[model samples]
Target chain A: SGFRKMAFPSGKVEGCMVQVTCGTTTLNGLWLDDVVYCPRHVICTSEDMLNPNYEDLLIRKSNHNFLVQAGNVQLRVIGHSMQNCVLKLKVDTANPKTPKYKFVRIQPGQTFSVLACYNGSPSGVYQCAMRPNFTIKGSFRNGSCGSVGFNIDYDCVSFCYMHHMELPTGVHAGTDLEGNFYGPFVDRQTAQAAGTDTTITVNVLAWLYAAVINGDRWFLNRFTTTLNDFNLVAMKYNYEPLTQDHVDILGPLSAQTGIAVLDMCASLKELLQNGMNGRTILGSALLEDEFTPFDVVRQCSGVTF
Target chain B: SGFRKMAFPSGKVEGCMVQVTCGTTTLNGLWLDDVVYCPRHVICTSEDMLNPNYEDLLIRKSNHNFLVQAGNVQLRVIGHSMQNCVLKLKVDTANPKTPKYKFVRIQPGQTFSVLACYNGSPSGVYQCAMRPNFTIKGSFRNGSCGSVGFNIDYDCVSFCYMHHMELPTGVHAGTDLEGNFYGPFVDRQTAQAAGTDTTITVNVLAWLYAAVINGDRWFLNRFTTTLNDFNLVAMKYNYEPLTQDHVDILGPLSAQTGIAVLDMCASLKELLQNGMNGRTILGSALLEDEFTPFDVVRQCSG
Candidate 1:
C-alpha cells in the first residue's frame, strides 16, 4: 500500500490534523525539519500540505496573542519574537498572509481576534486549515532571548465539512470546508465527482459528540483535499425508520463518496431495530471499535476517539 | 473588605485553584517566588493552600508524564527534571507526597495513569486537590536542558462539593470534598456547624453544566477550607412545582449554606413560574449575571 507516510512528533498518531514546522530543510525536496502535529482536522490544499511555511505571516511579532478563525475552528495562540514562524494554513485559491486580512493590531498585553478567510467574501471562513504547532520557534515575550515558548487553545467541530443528498434523484446540498455551498449538483458536484477511483482507500471514520447547537438530521460527506486529510462526518443512515427517501439519498451519496451502499444499509437496518435508540450508538455509551470495520475507522482516526 | 488578597500570576483571576512555586522567598512569611495558577477548583485544608510545596514529590523525575486523580479531577502532566517543583496539593489530614501515593513509575516516551487518592480506602478519593500550573519550573521532557517547560490537561466539575437537607426539617444528605458523606447530620454536621457567625460572609456561586452522568436533583453546600478558596455549588431552588417537599428542603439547606431564605424563595418562584421548564433556568439558555444578587454571588465565589 503506497500510503503517504511521514514521521510525526511525539503524542501524534494519525488523522487529518494541522502540522507545524520551523526553519528550512532539504529532506525529500521538502524545506522543513522538526515538525509537530495537532490532534485535529487540517484542510490545506497545498502540495506541501505536510510541511507548510507560515513564516511569511509572523516575522518578529512580539507580545501578542494571535487569535485566528478558520471556518468552524477557532484558535488562540500566544508567543513571542515570532521570527520566521510559518503556519501551515496557506491555501491554493488565495493567500491569507497579507495585511488586508489583519483585522486588528493587538497591543503588547491586550488580545484581539481575526478571521483569516476574509477574501472579500461576506462569509469569512478559511480556505485552508491553518494552525500553529503550539511551540514557539523563538523566545517567549520579553525574556530569555534565545528561549522559545508557545501555547494554543483550539476549538473545532467534529464534522467541519458536511454534504447531503436529498431524495428523488438526489438533490445535492451541503457546506464546503469554507462555509461555501457544495453546489446544487451542477458545478462542484461534477468537479469533485471527476476523480478516478485511486488505489488509496476512502476510510469512513465515526465519532459521536454531544451536539449542542444542531442535530436535526444526520449527514455524511467524503472530504478530499490536496493532502491526505482525515474526514469525519455523521453517517445519516443511522436514523430510525429509514424512509425510502433516506435510502434514495444514501444510494447516490454512496456513489459520490465512494462508500459501499450494502455496508451502510445493512448497518442501518440492524442498528435502527436493535431495541435501543439508534442515537445511542452515536454517543460514548456504545464503543465503536467492537464493530470490525468501524474499529478500523477508529484506528485510522487516531489514539483519541 | 478584609479579604486575604495576594498578587497572583497573569491570566489568573480569582477561584479555588492550585498554585505553583519554585525556590524560596520571605514575602508575607511565604517562601516562594515565580508563582503560577490554574483556572479550576482547589481543595486543600492546609493553612498555606495559597502556596504549596510539591517540590518534594517531583525532584529529579526526568521525562515522565505524572498522572494524578483527585476525586473527579484528573491531570496528565509532562515535564522535565523536576527539582524543587512543589505542587499546591498538601492537605491537613494526610501528606500525599509519600511513596505510598506513588502507585507506579512511568518510563520516558511511554504513558501511564495513576490514582493519587488511595489510602487503604476502597473509594480512593483525594483529601486535598493536586494540580500543576502548566508551566515547568525546570525544562521540558528532553532538550533545552536549562529551559523550563510543562503542559497539563485539566478535567473537573462545576460542583465538586455538594450537600442537601431533606424535607420535614431537612434529611441532611450529601458528599464531602472527598466522596465521603456530609453525614446523616447526627455527628459531622455539629462539627462543621460549630463556629459562630464570623465577619467573613458566606457567598453562593452558581453555574449550570450539561450534566451527562448525574443531575437527578439540585443541591447546595457552603464549602469551607482553611484558605480563602472559592466555593461553587448548585442552587437547588430552581426546581418547579416547589412541592411543599422541595421548599421544605430548600429552607433548611438555605440556613446551612448561609444563604438567606427569602432570596432563595423569591428567586425560586420567579424561575420556576417563568413558564418554562424549571430546568431551563439551570442551563446555558439563561443569563445568570443579570440576576443582581446572583451576579454578586458569581463575583464573591471568585
Candidate 2:
C-alpha cells in the first residue's frame, strides 16, 4: 500500500503558522498541535519539541533517507502575514560525521516560509525551528518526527537586522590578489563540507624568478622564423639532424629542468659547421637576399675570404 | 667745354621705324643698320632672334657718328617689326673684347623710344639688328652711328620661343647614356671648362648600399636608439665591455659598407649579462644622458 501524504495551511499560529491534514487512513492517533511558542517557552515544551541552535544542525541517516523519498511528497507554505522571521525545517540522523547546516541572512520586516518533504527510516530525529526575531522571545521545534513519508508547510514573521544586504568588493578567497570579490561562507570548515577546494596559497614569487626573457615579441618571431626555415631546408636534403631517440632522452629532461643546454649546444654546433666555409648558410644568405645588390655582395664576400 | 650727346627724331628707317626726340640741343643724323649680313635669309628669318647661327653672318663694324650736346634725348622705333625684339644703342668700339652695347626687343607694331642724358665719348658707332622673332635676320649698321651714349628704345611682343628655354625632356648636352647620367664630360667641353671636380661620377657605391639597407625608417630609429643608449652608458662608466665596442665599430662600418652584420653573438652576450639579470638600459635613459648603453659601447669598442 502507498504511504499517506501531509498538508498544512497558513495563519494557524502567532509569529508562525502550521496546519496539517492527515491521510484518509490514519494508523494511530498522535498528539499534534499547530501553536506558536515564544523562545522562552522552548525549554518548557515537550522534549520532542525542544529547539536546537542553528549552528548545531547536522545530517544523519534519517536526513539521507528523507532526501531519497522527498520527491513523492508535496508541501506548500505561505508566510505573507509574517515579518522579519525565519522558519526552518531540518532532519538529523545519528551520523556524527554529518556537517553543520545554517541559514543565510533573512532581512528585517520580511516573511519567510519553507516546505520540506521527508521519506525514510529515522535514524535520529527531524525537527522544525522558528525564530521571530533576534530576541528569540519566540522559538520552538518539533522533534523526532517519524514517518514513512512526511510533508511540512511552515510560515514565520519576525524583525531581523538588515545587515550584509550589499555585496562586497575587492575581496578574495585565495592568495591570488584578484580572486573572488563575493560573499563569505560560515567558515572554511563549512565551505569544505560543501566540497569546496579552499587552498588559497599560491607561489607567485617562484614564477617571477624562473621567467624566460627571450619571449620578447620581436626576438621570438625572428628566432622561430629562422629555425623553421632551416628545418625546412634540412628536411629537403634528407637530413635528420636530431634523432627521435635523442629527442626522447632530452625532451623530458628539458621540460623537468626548464633548461635545454643540449639543444642550444647542438644548434650552435650546426651553425658553426655550416658557416665556417663561407658557403652562405641560411642566415647570411637570407640577409644578402633581402638586402644589398650583387656588387655590394661580391665586395663583402670577397673581403670575407 | 661740356661733352655733347647724340640725338635723333623718332621716325622710320629701312623695313623698321625709328622715333627720336632731342632736348634743348641740336639734332644729329640717326643711324639704322645691321652690323652683320645673313648668308641665308631663311636662316635669318628663323625663330629665336638672340640666338642666331652667328657663324653664317658677314660681320662688320660701322663708323658713322651722330653728335649733339643735350640735357635729354628720346628715340622711338616703329615698323613691320620683330616679335620680342630689342633696339640697342651700342658704342661699337674697335676692340672686340671692349665693345660697349645695349639692346631691347622691338614689338611688331609699336613705337619704341628712350630718353637719356649724355656726356661720354661720341666717336663710336650705332646700329640696329633686325630681330624678327628670337633670331636676327639681316642687320643694318649704317647711318649716323655714334657712341656718345645713344638713346635706345624697344617695344617687345611675344616671340614663338624664348632663347633661354630649357631643352625638352631626355635631351641633354651629352649623348652617351653613362656619360650623360654619370659623365666624364666628354661631350660637355663647356662643363669641363667649368671644373674637373664638378664632373659627375659614381665614386662611392658603398654609401648607397648602406642607405638602402639601414635607411629604412623603422630600422634606423631602433638601431640609433640601441647604439646611442649602449654607447652612452658604457662611456659614462668607462666599462671596457668587449661587445659594446664591437657594436660601435660594426655599426659605422655597416653604414659605410652598406652591410650590417646582425651580430647575434653580441645580442646573446648582452642578454646573458644584463637582460637575464633584469637590468634595463632604456633608450630614454641613453637619450637623456647622451651615452650608449654598456652593451652597445662594448660592441663598438671592438
Candidate 3:
C-alpha cells in the first residue's frame, strides 16, 4: 500500500498520532468516515503479559521456565497468567487471507508458549499473537519490538509492519497505512483465493540475511537462489545513509525492552566454539496487530490511510 | 549479505569502488599481498553491448512479432540472430546446483526471445541468457529496458544487480566498494557452472519493479505477502532516482534502440478509461553482471 502520511493540513504542527475507542466490542485503530482506520492494538492486559514468537524455542535449562522444540518452527509462547488460560494464537499462512491458529492454557503462575512458525518462505512474513481471555482494562505499558542485529541480521521482534511494498519513487514499505495494500489481492474479501500473477513484481536489491551460524556473510543466500526462502525472506536495505530527502520509511532499531540484541559474528564464532553457531537476533516485539498509532507515527511517516 | 563500502585505511581517503578486466584484472584500494580487490566489471563487451534481463517480452501485435500469454513469467528474448539457431536457455530451481534449460533455435535475421521466468520463490532469482555461435563482427548497438505507464509501473529491462542483500550501515547500496562483498558468487564453477561475489545489484525497494497492466499503486504487493516475490523484491528505499546516479547500476529506462516496458492500467485501460489511479516505477538499467567500477562510485555519496 503506497501509503504516505497526510501532510499537515496547514503548517508546521509539532506532532500527530492516532487514537481509538470501542463500544460494545474489542477493537483497534481509528474510525473515520465510516471505516475503522489503523486499529488500536492490544499490547498487554492488566492480568498478565504476552509475547509473540519469542525464540526458536530459546532453551531455559530451568526447573519451571523450560522449552521444548516442535515442527519446522513450533516456538512455544511464554506468558504469565491464571489457570486454564484460554489464549488464542492466530497464525498468518502463505496466503494473507487464510490464517491458522493455536490456543493454549498457561496454568496458574505458569508460562505458556505457542508453536508459531514462519509458516511460508524466507521472505515469508508470519506473525503469531498471544491474546488471553481476560477482560480489557484499557491498560497500557512500555511495550517492545525488535533490536538491531549489527546490520542485516534481524529476527524475533524486528520484522513487523515490514509490508515489503515499494513505491516507484524509491521508497520501501512493509505494511499498508490502513488498507490491506500488502494483501494477496486488493479486494481479498471478494478476490478469488487462487492464481499467481508472476508478472506483478518489483525488483529488489538487498542483502538476504541468513541465520547460518558462523557461515559466510551471505551463506544463507544460497538457498535463496531457488524459490524457497527467496520467496519467504523480506528484502531489506538502507535509506537514511545518504541525502536528507531519503525515504523516512524505516523502524526504530528496536524498543527499549525485550528488543532482540544483535551480534556481528554469531555464525563463525559458534562454528569455532560449539561447532554449530550462536547468533544474535533483533527486531520488533509488538505484533502487527499490537502496533499502535504512535508506533506508526514513530516508525514511519504519516500516511493517507 | 550485509554489504558495506570500506571507510578506507591510512586516514580515510574520501571514497572508492571496484573495477576489473579478464587477464589478472587491474584494480585499486586495500592492496593486500600486492593486489587491490574489487575487480572491474565490463559494462559493455568490446565487440558489441550487453544488458541484463531486457524485456518483459516486448513485441509486435501482428503476424511477424507476437506475445503469447503463459504461466508464471513468459518473456520473448529480442535479439539479432540466425534461423533455427541452436541456443540453450537455462532455468534455476530449488537447487542452485542444477539449472533447468530450454533449447531454442533462432530464425535467421529474426530477433529471438526467451521466456526466462523468475521461477520459484521470492528469493528465487532466475535469468535467460542468449549465447549464439557466430563470430563477433563488432555487432554493437543500443539497448532498452522499460517503458512506464499510467501507474508507477515498470518491468523487463530493470532487475539486475538486484541481489536481495542487506548492509550494516544505513546507506542504501546497489554496488560494492569498501569490500568485494556483493559477489557474483565465485566457484559459481564446481561453485556451480561458476561465479564471484559482485558488489553489484539492481536498485529496488521492498518489491522490485512489477508493472501491473491495470491497477492501483500497491496493487502488486498482494502476492508479495508470502515469500515468492517478497524476498526477490529489493527493499530499495533510496539510492538514485531519474537519471545520473541511475545508470550507476542500470541500463537506460528507454534506450535509443530497444528496451522492455510495463503498464498496469495498460491492460484495463483498454477495458476502462483512465480514472482514479496511476503509479510510479523507478530503478536502474544495467544488469547485476553489467555493473562497472564507475557505476559503484557514482551513485551514493562520498
DockQ of each: 0.04, 0.00, 0.01
User: Candidate 2: misplaced stretches above 4 Å?
Assistant: A1-305, B1-53, B58-165, B170-214, B217-302
TM-score of each: 0.22, 0.12, 0.19
Model 3 chain A scores worst on lDDT over the 10 consecutive residues at A8-17
Query: Cα lDDT for residue B61, model 1?
Result: 36
Per-model chain A TM: 0.19, 0.14, 0.19
| Worst ten in a row by lDDT for model 1 chain B | B1-10
How much does each candidate deviate from the true structure in C-alpha RMSD?
A: 20.9, 45.1, 25.2
Q: After TM-score superposition, what is the CA distance of residue A182 in candidate 1 from its true location, in Å?
A: 3.1
Give one digit per residue, the lDDT tens place, for model 1 in B65-136: 222322234333333232121122222222231111111211111111111101111100111111111110
Over the stretch A1-305, how does candidate 1's per-residue lDDT look in tens digits?
Answer: 00111111111100122212222211000001112111111112224333433343244332232222222343333332221111223222221211111112111111111111011111101111101111101101111111101111121112222221121211222222222322222111132331111111111122211111113124322322221111111222322132234334334335534544444433333433352343443332232211112222222232110
Per-residue lDDT tens digits for candidate 2, residues A72-126, read 3322211111111211223221222221222234311111221111121111111
Highest-TM-score candidate: 1
- Candidate 3 lDDT score at position B238: 17
**lDDT-best of 1 and 3:** 1
Q: Name the top DockQ candidate.
A: 1
